[PDB]
């Protein structure tokens, strides 16, 4: 045929224009090779309904210039001209363009600088199904721009997956526009891999068996390049002469990418070994068999280490289904999933969005600069996790970016750079232009690390790699600094500020380090740097959930210089306590950098504010048990626990062991005047100190609603026995409860007392919290025995109404 086929996106275009000129957001769904990226933009550009410029966000650099260059050929122009692109370290735009194809956070920069996006009428978020943090952040900003003046700014969200329905739950007013092609049925099979076989052998065996039983070319999904290589080797010995093996990763041989995408040559079949880029973004042709290992490799932020790691995990049902459908574009196909069916049925329904698994220090920095005081104010498909926002806040504090709940003066400069916050912090902390140039080079290195196996950051620094140089110049421009001379002697204090938690000290054996944040860091025992005791390790590869990581890039520091240069790194902590194990007084001063003990020394004659503080730390060592816990103090503590359960509408203080240990400075220290010895620790009035946690009102409330004593009908004051878990109990002679028809209660009438009803001899007759039932029930059997063992007492037939003998 000579006249090309009108792409399927053409057939859906009129529906799109109608929705485009009707709603503030339009959602478009269409297969990836349908031309939604490489065609549709121009026709929205030529459409008079759209006013001005159109921005097209792409998830990665490689995608972005494919779209811009390919779409330029349609207008018979080269790019930069009418169709342009922007990247993190390159710009291609004239006085000319109307369609810009951006990536690598560029869209975020544009909106930050021009929050009304002047001249722009339509923004397109492509490959939205990948749920990048970048595209989520773009979506949130753009929805806020649209609630300002810009109620004319239209928005096209393009997804390659059929339905995306947590998106209309966010946007019910949004027209869904669906382009779909022929999708053939795919039979789904399951096969767990045996525990006694390697992954690569097991996958190769399963795959060779599929080739043996079934006809066609085969697409094999694997977690990454390494697995692709290893399975390929194992496959090579188990396949026939007609089977052509075709790996598929970005780092490949240009034509090897084509050999994998294009149909197998005549007479032969192909096995395409790919990562999940083949799942939605890439169209591999000639495929009717899929083998799905069902295992992804994803970035995971660890709030306890502040590190991001690559973990491997089970793929979701939605992506297993998307993977299976890759066997159904040509003809009816077959998909084999390398897990048991029941495990597939229990996999998460949907994939986890990047915003839930990543470092949010950059995002938080963006929202603050955007003017957002709390991330919840924005509209997210998925709200940022509280735990990671807190970790982000803490990091920004460490970097000095925050002033209360807003950006500090330095924080605003960091936000202007647009950089990773730790790296931005480093740049902004430079005190002169030589420190600036040093910081810029370090930053360009940490953004694009060397790809040899060299751990010394001073080595990379001394290299004059041209791409690093380019990035440095760009960062200095943003920083508004020029003409300084970089110097390696200026590196350590710059690093110290932005990576203080990653200062590393050698621990007992060469190669074993502990970081200031307390975690373990490993370097090869035969590494030049592992000859030294103190390092700063900005780049770390965490093995997995275990707080242990490999050191990838590090700098050697003389710790004495560093602490002298940066005194704020070192905090002081005194401890006084009694060692029962050896019957001696322990009293030391510890200088520490984070969790790293730098020096321990005998405590010199301390001030008294110092001594009291040192004793608090000793209590943290030995536990609250060293204080004097009277029955009364403990009962108070228990009453506070019970109040929080039974009277939760009030703000009762936490009084669990850890809250108390954590707050010693607030509740215990004020009372430590005149305590000059460990002996005096037992003299502190623990009851009064705990009671001090309550204002006058709450003290009255607690004394009234959870009273220490209950007054019974005789006028006697009987102690209530509180307990962390059991109902409050009241041990009382039965005779004293005469005249009371209703079981006693405390806590605003919410909690009946468990009555331990006793005989004259203080012997338990009945345990009840339904006193009314007791009088009518078991009492008549108790009355006869009380008429037998104590005939000298009156045991009335109607105790509920018998006048109480007034004691008082």
From Swiss-Prot:
Domain Helicase C-terminal: 198-371
Motif DEFH box location, chain numbering: 126-129
Keyword Transcription regulation among UniProt keywords: no
GO molecular function terms attached to this record: ATP binding; ATP hydrolysis activity; ribonucleoside triphosphate phosphatase activity; RNA helicase activity; single-stranded RNA binding
Pfam families xrefs: CON_HrpB, DEAD, Helicase_C, HrpB_C
UniProt key word Calcium: no
Helicase ATP-binding domain ranges (all copies): 17-180
Domain of life of the source: Bacteria
Catalytic activity field: ATP + H2O = ADP + phosphate + H(+)
Binding-site positions, ATP: 30-37
Residue segments, region Disordered: 791-808
Annotated protein name in UniProt: ATP-dependent RNA helicase HrpB
Organism: Escherichia coli (strain K12)
């Amino acid at each position: 045929a000579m006249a090309m086929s009108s792409l399927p996106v053409a057939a859906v275009l009129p529906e799109l224009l109608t929705a485009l000129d009707c709603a503030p957001q339009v959602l478009l769904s269409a297969p990836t090779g349908a031309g939604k990226s490489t065609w549709l933009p121009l026709q929205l550009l030529a459409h008079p309904g759209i006013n001005g410029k159109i921005i097209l966000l792409e998830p990665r650099r490689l995608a972005a210039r494919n779209v811009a260059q390919r779409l330029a050929e349609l207008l018979n122009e080269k790019p930069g001209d009418t169709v342009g692109y922007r990247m993190r370290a390159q710009n291609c735009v004239g006085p000319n363009t109307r369609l810009e194809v951006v990536t690598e956070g560029v869209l975020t920069r544009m909106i930050q600088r021009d929050p009304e996006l002047s001249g722009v009428g339509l923004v397109i978020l492509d490959e939205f199904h990948e749920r990048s943090l970048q595209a989520d952040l773009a979506l949130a900003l753009l929805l806020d721009v649209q609630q300002g003046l810009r109620d004319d700014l239209k928005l096209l969200i393009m997804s390659a997956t059929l339905d995306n329905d947590r998106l209309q739950q966010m946007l019910p007013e949004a027209p869904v526009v669906i382009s779909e092609g022929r999708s053939f049925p795919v039979e789904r099979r399951y096969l767990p891999l045996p525990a006694h076989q390697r992954f690569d052998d097991a996958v190769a065996v399963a795959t060779a068996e599929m080739l043996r039983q079934e006809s066609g070319s085969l697409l094999l999904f694997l977690p990454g390049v390494g697995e692709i290589q290893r399975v390929q080797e194992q496959l090579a010995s188990r396949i026939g002469s007609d089977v052509l093996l075709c790996p598929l990763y970005g780092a490949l041989s240009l034509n090897d990418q084509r050999k994998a995408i294009l149909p197998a040559p005549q007479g032969m079949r192909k096995v395409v070994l790919a990562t999940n880029i083949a799942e939605t973004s890439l169209t591999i042709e000639g495929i009717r068999l899929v083998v799905d290992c069902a295992q992804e490799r994803v970035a995971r932020f660890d709030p306890r280490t502040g590190l991001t790691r690559l973990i491997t995990q089970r793929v979701s049902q939605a992506s297993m289904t998307q993977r299976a459908g890759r066997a159904g574009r040509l003809e009816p196909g077959i998909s084999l999933h390398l897990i048991a069916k029941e495990q597939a049925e229990r996999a998460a329904a949907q994939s986890e969005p990047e915003i839930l698994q990543s470092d949010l220090s950059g995002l938080l920095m963006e929202l603050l600069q955007w003017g957002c005081s709390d991330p919840a104010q924005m509209s997210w498909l998925d709200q940022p996790p509280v735990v990671n926002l807190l970790a982000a806040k803490r990091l920004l504090q460490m970097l000095g970016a925050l002033e209360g709940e807003r950006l500090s003066a330095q924080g605003q400069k960091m936000a202007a750079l647009g950089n990773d916050p730790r790296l931005a912090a480093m740049l902004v902390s430079a005190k002169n232009d030589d420190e600036a140039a040093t910081a810029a080079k370090i930053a360009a290195i940490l953004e694009e690390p060397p790809r040899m196996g060299n751990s010394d950051l001073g080595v990379a620094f001394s290299r004059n790699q041209p791409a690093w140089q380019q990035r440095s110049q760009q960062l200095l421009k943003r920083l508004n600094v020029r003409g300084g001379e970089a110097d390696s002697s200026l590196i350590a204090p710059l690093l110290a500020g932005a990576f203080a938690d990653r200062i590393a000290r050698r621990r007992g054996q060469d190669g074993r380090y502990q970081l200031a944040n307390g975690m373990g860091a490993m370097l090869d025992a035969n590494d030049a740097l592992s000859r030294h005791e103190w390092l700063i390790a900005p780049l770390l590869l965490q093995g997995s959930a275990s707080p242990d990581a490999r050191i990838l890039l590090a700098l050697l520091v003389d710790i004495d210089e560093l602490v002298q240069r940066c005194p704020q790194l070192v905090q002081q902590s005194d401890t006084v306590e009694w060692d029962d194990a050896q019957g001696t007084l322990k009293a030391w001063r510890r200088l520490q950098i984070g969790q790293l003990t730098v020096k321990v020394q005998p405590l010199a004659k301390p001030s008294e504010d110092e001594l009291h503080q040192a004793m608090l730390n000793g209590i943290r060592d030995k536990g609250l048990s060293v204080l004097n816990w009277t029955a009364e103090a403990e009962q108070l503590r228990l009453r506070l626990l019970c109040a929080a359960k039974w009277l939760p509408e009030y703000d009762w203080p936490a009084v669990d062991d850890e809250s108390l240990l954590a707050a010693l400075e607030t509740w215990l220290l004020p009372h430590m005047t005149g305590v000059h010895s460990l002996r005096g620790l037992k003299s502190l009035d623990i009851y009064q100190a705990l009671r001090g946690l309550l204002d006058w009102g709450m003290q009255q409330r607690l004394d009234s609603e959870l009273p220490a004593h209950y007054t019974v009908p005789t006028g006697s004051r009987i102690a209530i026995r509180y307990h962390e878990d059991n109902p409050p109990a009241l041990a009382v002679r039965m005779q004293e409860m005469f005249g009371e028809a209703t079981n006693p209660t405390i806590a605003q009438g919410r909690v009946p007392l468990v009555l331990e009803l006793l005989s004259p001899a203080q012997r338990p007759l009945q345990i009840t919290r339904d006193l009314s039932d007791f009088w009518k029930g078991a009492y008549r059997e108790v009355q006869k025995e009380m008429k037998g063992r104590y005939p000298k007492h009156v045991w009335p037939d109607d105790p509920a109404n018998t006048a109480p003998t007034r004691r008082t």
